[PDB]
Amino acid sequence: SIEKIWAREILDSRGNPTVEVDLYTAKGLFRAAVPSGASTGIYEALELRDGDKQRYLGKGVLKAVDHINSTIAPALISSGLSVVEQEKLDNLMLELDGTENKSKFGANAILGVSLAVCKAGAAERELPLYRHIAQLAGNSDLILPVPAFNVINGGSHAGNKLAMQEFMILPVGAESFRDAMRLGAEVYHTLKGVIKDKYGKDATNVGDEGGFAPNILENSEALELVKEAIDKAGYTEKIVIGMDVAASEFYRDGKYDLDFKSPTDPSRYITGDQLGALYQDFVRDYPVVSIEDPFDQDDWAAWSKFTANVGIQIVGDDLTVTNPKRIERAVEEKACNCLLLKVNQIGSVTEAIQACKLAQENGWGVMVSHRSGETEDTFIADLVVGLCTGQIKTGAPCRSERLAKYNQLMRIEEELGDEARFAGHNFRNPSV
Amino acid sequence: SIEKIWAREILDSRGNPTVEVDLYTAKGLFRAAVPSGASTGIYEALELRDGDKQRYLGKGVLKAVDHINSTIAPALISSGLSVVEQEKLDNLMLELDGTENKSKFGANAILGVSLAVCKAGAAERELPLYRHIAQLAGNSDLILPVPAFNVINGGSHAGNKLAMQEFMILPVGAESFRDAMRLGAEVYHTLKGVIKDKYGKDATNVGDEGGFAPNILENSEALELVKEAIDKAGYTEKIVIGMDVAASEFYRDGKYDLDFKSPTDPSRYITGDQLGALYQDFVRDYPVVSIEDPFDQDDWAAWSKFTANVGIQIVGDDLTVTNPKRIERAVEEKACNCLLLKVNQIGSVTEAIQACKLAQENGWGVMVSHRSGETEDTFIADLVVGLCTGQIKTGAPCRSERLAKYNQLMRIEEELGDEARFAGHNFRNPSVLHH
Numbered sequence: 001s002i003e004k005i006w007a008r009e010i011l012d013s014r015g016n017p018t019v020e021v022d023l024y025t026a027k028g029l030f031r032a033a034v035p036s037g038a039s040t041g042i043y044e045a046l047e048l049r050d051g052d053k054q055r056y057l058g059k060g061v062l063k064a065v066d067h068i069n070s071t072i073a074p075a076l077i078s079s080g081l082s083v084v085e086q087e088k089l090d091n092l093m094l095e096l097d098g099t100e101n102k103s104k105f106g107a108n109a110i111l112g113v114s115l116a117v118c119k120a121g122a123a124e125r126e127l128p129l130y131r132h133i134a135q136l137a138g139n140s141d142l143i144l145p146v147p148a149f150n151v152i153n154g155g156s157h158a159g160n161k162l163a164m165q166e167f168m169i170l171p172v173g174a175e176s177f178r179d180a181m182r183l184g185a186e187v188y189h190t191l192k193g194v195i196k197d198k199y200g201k202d203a204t205n206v207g208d209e210g211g212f213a214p215n216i217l218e219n220s221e222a223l224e225l226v227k228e229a230i231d232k233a234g235y236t237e238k239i240v241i242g243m244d245v246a247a248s249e250f251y252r253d254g255k256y257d258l259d260f261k262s263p264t265d266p267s268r269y270i271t272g273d274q275l276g277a278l279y280q281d282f283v284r285d286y287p288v289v290s291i292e293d294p295f296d297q298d299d300w301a302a303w304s305k306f307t308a309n310v311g312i313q314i315v316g317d318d319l320t321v322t323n324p325k326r327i328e329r330a331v332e333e334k335a336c337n338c339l340l341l342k343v344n345q346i347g348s349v350t351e352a353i354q355a356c357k358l359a360q361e362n363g364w365g366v367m368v369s370h371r372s373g374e375t376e377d378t379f380i381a382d383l384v385v386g387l388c389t390g391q392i393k394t395g396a397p398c399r400s401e402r403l404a405k406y407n408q409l410m411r412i413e414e415e416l417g418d419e420a421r422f423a424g425h426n427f428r429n430p431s432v
Numbered sequence: 433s434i435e436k437i438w439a440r441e442i443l444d445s446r447g448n449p450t451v452e453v454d455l456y457t458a459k460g461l462f463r464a465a466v467p468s469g470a471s472t473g474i475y476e477a478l479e480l481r482d483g484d485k486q487r488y489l490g491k492g493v494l495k496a497v498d499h500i501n502s503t504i505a506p507a508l509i510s511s512g513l514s515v516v517e518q519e520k521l522d523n524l525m526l527e528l529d530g531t532e533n534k535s536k537f538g539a540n541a542i543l544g545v546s547l548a549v550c551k552a553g554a555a556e557r558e559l560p561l562y563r564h565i566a567q568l569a570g571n572s573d574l575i576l577p578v579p580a581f582n583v584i585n586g587g588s589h590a591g592n593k594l595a596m597q598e599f600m601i602l603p604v605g606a607e608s609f610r611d612a613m614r615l616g617a618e619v620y621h622t623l624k625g626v627i628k629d630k631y632g633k634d635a636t637n638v639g640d641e642g643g644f645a646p647n648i649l650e651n652s653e654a655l656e657l658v659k660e661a662i663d664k665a666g667y668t669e670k671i672v673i674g675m676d677v678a679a680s681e682f683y684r685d686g687k688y689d690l691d692f693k694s695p696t697d698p699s700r701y702i703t704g705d706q707l708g709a710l711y712q713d714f715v716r717d718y719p720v721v722s723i724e725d726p727f728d729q730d731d732w733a734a735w736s737k738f739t740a741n742v743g744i745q746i747v748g749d750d751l752t753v754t755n756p757k758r759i760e761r762a763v764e765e766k767a768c769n770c771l772l773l774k775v776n777q778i779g780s781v782t783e784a785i786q787a788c789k790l791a792q793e794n795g796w797g798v799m800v801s802h803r804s805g806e807t808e809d810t811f812i813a814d815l816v817v818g819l820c821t822g823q824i825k826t827g828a829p830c831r832s833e834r835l836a837k838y839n840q841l842m843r844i845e846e847e848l849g850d851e852a853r854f855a856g857h858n859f860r861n862p863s864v865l866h867h
């Protein structure tokens with residue numbers, strides 16, 4: 001059973017409050033913290049913020065923390081449920097909140113406990129967290145994912161005109177996870193130089209996820225820069241590119257604005273067809289293997305049409321919000337073929353594992369993901385290995401809310417020893 | 433005793449390899465990682481890198497890792513010393529390296545083990561790390577420091593012309609550490625908007641330490657931006673400014689280049705006297721209460737002259753490199769009045785504690801500090817509390833290699849409860865504060 005639960009407000013990687021939970025059992029103290037998105041889809045479970053405009057600019061999480069300390073904690077302690085009972089504990093918190101979208105307590109309240117429970121459960125089972133998660137998920141295997149490093153930041157994560165959010169490199173040809181880290185870092189460092197040589201040092205500062213924030217507008221130019229860095233680093237045969245467009249951020253009036261960080265000008269909007277055509281160009285001209293949120297979270301028609309006309313990975317993020325109900329629709333409409341798995345989009349570990357299992361059962365990839373507001377928490381490193389998904393995006397190899405995860409993946413790889421498997425080229429279908 | 437030690441290469445906050453050490457005792461696994469500077473003083477202990485130009489652009493630390501795993505580990509295991517014996521264990525490593533600057537094993541090797549030992553030692557004591565550190569240092573009455581948040585980054589930490597490395601805000605007027613975090617974060621967010629409004633969104637990306645990296649040249653303008661943000665956030669009466677000039681980074685031919693990231697042009701260099709005059713203006717025009725490395729690490733006369741002619745805090749960083757030998761000279765020459773305490777400039781916990789104690793015995797302040805290449809390690813949070821120094825600089829409230837420390841300090845404050853005392857306006861001298 002749980003002895004004590006105590007939540008507090010900490011600061012995330014952008015300097016905004018978030019929830020941290022300390023959970024005590026007879027095995028010790030288990031601590032987890034909750035990330036926070038910037039480009040948050042409208043269907044995400046509620047992130048409860050205090051809205052006191054004088055305090056942390058409205059972004060405190062005192063209410064969430066209080067819901068944990070005043071309500072969730074005593075209920076879960078009094079239940080006497082063992083922390084190995086992840087689903088029962090998670091379901092009890094869902095029932096306690098009583099709302100579909102976790103708007104009574106906040107998904108951030110619930111998730112913080114959920115995560116700490118999971119860590120505590122692992123200890124109760126005398127298992128590393130990744131193995132506990134694997135058992136929760138009904139997995140026998142463990143595989144190290146290909147990391148997708150967001151090395152050029154745009155969209156809502158960077159001060160630049162670049163509309164698409166993330167340009168990532170995936171070292172699919174690395175020999176191991178540790179090697180993939182080296183490949184990603186070398187390319188990242190190379191890219192700093194490619195950017196400085198063309199744009200000057202003012203273009204070499206970083207956005208929220210640690211990728212460079214060059215002063216460019218054209219998304220194709222981001223791809224060019226990444227491709228050039230890959231080449232210059234000597235890894236053209238081993239590194240491919242993924243993008244997160246985050247198109248819901250620039251959807252306007254049924255159309256899309258690829259200059260949305262510039263003052264409003266509807267004549268520059270393009271249709272979903274035009275946007276798709278651009279993607280096709282990117283796929284033809286660059287080693288783009290994966291595009292996330294190519295279209296708005298409600299533009300089902302565009303997702304389905306596009307997915308049916310390409311062979312690349314198409315990742316639902318805001319489309320699916322780690323939510324089995326949305327995933328079912330996406331599966332039925334063949335809207336995408338990969339789920340981005342963000343535990344705080346849904347609000348509990350159990351529901352995130354269910355979402356993953358649902359995707360995988362329907363033949364989708366799953367990419368575990370950070371949020372752009374992260375913490376020093378490294379849960380998602382254990383999560384991706386336990387869920388065997390083959391792919392994780394958790395930042396550039398810059399800013400330690402990113403490296404914390406990457407370093408933890410290296411540690412897990414080391415732990416697995418000669419049993420360590422790296423998904424490599426099978427990142428989309430690592431089950432094989 | 434120590435049962436096993438195993439070091440690995442991890443990546444730091446800039447994406448460069450660094451040392452992490454796992455140390456096992458019967459109480460479990462204790463893990464620590466070593467930070468890395470960018471603007472590193474010539475007198476810092478050696479950071480051993482592999483120099484394999486093809487791997488991590490020569491920045492691997494496999495050699496350090498191997499020294500730990502194959503040479504230091506058996507030595508410490510063989511010693512049978514308990515992990516509580518920090519000084520004995522550090523001394524064993526120092527003697528085994530046997531070099532002045534830790535150039536056999538690398539300071540990064542020795543420090544990684546030293547830190548892990550310290551954590552293991554705390555557990556052996558069944559003490560929180562900050563309390564173990566306090567005992568190591570001979571302190572009883574612990575203090576939460578004023579945080580110094582580097583909210584505009586320049587110098588070698590940012591892609592801008594701005595030559596001076598760090599512009600910090602210090603919430604001396606805050607009620608508590610948790611409150612200081614709120615003040616600093618609110619100013620930081622406010623500052624983003626001040627910058628965006630004046631210089632555009634392109635100016636609101638961040639540098640290595642999480643501070644904005646606006647496309648400015650003039651250091652006065654960084655101060656103006658910070659002062660404006662403080663005032664707009666409503667905290668003029670509670671937040672002051674500190675700077676890390678890191679002048680050794682732009683010392684050129686006995687003069688100083690405040691546009692050193694622009695193609696060389698000696699006509700623009702200024703003398704140390706001109707530089708000092710500039711600082712005097714800063715101190716008069718802005719609420720600057722602390723300046724670090726105002727002159728080159730070897731420009732002793734400048735330092736003494738300046739310190740003698742100001743009433744603010746002057747912090748040795750590259751001057752002193754957390755090195756009692758250099759500190760002794762600084763004291764004698766009254767070169768500065770505060771030590772920046774960076775464990776990896778000297779390479780062991782014991783030496784860093786000694787350095788701290790030497791400073792404090794001589795009436796100096798001590799500001800515990802990160803490096804610009806940090807990790808998710810939070811050691812220095814416990815260190816600053818345990819050493820009761822009253823001041824820590826460990827980043828903007830942005831990038832979790834920064835926030836991990838600040839968050840840890842909030843947890844420490846919570847753990848100390850009604851025994852929590854915040855240094856506040858006594859950041860230079862917190863011993864005055866009763867318990």
Ligand SMILES: [F-]
Binds near residue numbers: 039165244246317
């Ligand atoms: F996103």
Ligand SMILES: [F-]
Binds near residue numbers: 317369
């Ligand atoms: F995302």
Ligand SMILES: [F-]
Binds near residue numbers: 471597676678749
């Ligand atoms: F420095």
Ligand SMILES: [F-]
Binds near residue numbers: 676749801
């Ligand atoms: F520094």
Ligand SMILES: [Mg+2]
Binds near residue numbers: 037038039041246317
């Ligand atoms: Mg988003």
Ligand SMILES: [Mg+2]
Binds near residue numbers: 246293317
């Ligand atoms: Mg996304």
Ligand SMILES: [Mg+2]
Binds near residue numbers: 473
């Ligand atoms: Mg420096």
Ligand SMILES: [Mg+2]
Binds near residue numbers: 676724725
């Ligand atoms: Mg310095």
